[PDB]
Write a protein that binds this ligand. Sequence first.
Ligand SMILES: [Mg+2]
Ligand SMILES: [Mg+2]
Ligand SMILES: [Mg+2]
Ligand SMILES: [Mg+2]
Lengths: 171, 171
Amino acid sequence: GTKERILEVSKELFFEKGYQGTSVEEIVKRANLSKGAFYFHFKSKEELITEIIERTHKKIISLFEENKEKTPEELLEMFLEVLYREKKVVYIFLFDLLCSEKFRNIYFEKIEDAKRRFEKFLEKHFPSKAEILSEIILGFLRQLILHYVIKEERELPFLKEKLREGLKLIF
Amino acid sequence: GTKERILEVSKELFFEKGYQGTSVEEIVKRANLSKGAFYFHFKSKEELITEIIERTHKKIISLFEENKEKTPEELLEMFLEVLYREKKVVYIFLFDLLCSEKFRNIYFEKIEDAKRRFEKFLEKHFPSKAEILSEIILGFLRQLILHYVIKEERELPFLKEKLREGLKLIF
Ligand SMILES: [Mg+2]
Ligand SMILES: [Mg+2]
Ligand SMILES: [Mg+2]
Ligand SMILES: [Mg+2]
């Protein structure tokens, strides 16, 4: 519906030119909507970006819930696939949240939540190493995204090959 | 000398309030120097931050050159110690270079150089795994710095314990 359309247009504009550099006026113009339509769904630009992040986080929560019986390697392959599909939001997450002073806490809150869930999953078969593995693997996944999605946009097969080999070495 | 004093004051101010939010006037005022003294050593604010990064990078180059005969675990322990001592510059590197549009390329150039050197070091005893290990280990080290130096400033012993256990698991 309209809320979905606003979210899509906002993700596009924030990806293209940042949160600070995009106004509600530009968003509604691009979406061919009135300001009233926007404010009916979002009370502020702040609520809007928070929802964008929240919805991608929810896909991550779903990923963990729906794949808790998979091997760590397969769960991680799925995690990378979702992040790649959501790469515009990943870009916003880094440049508009981590890089900000106001939203830095959200960036870390979401990472910590993903880390807690990943740890819980790993405690099942690697209890004494789950804490360590979560740091290593999240660090490795972030290195791959930063260099092969953010610095340069490589195609997904390349990232999957890198992830697969690194996880094989680790496990 | 004077150049060193300017560098120290600039690292402090950029750490405290960012590159964009710090002026040459504030730097020379804090250093009790004239603008002429500043311009004798730096032609611009851009040259100044570039030199700050270049000097910390040089400490990294030295680290690799001076410890090429150490075990990977010990070389990495030293790498973490230097990054921790240089944590104000690490903070500037992320928030003033990666987060910028103008200086993003420098952030990646330096990381790539560190990665190339680390890879070369690892090719000696783990040729077929050096490329993979460099991604994993740099990712892991970055995860530890981001969460335990940037998000919250933990003391060095904690970071070293985390690094030690993760490298033991990897190697
Ligand atoms: Mg598969
Ligand atoms: Mg698949
Ligand atoms: Mg030692
Ligand atoms: Mg030591």
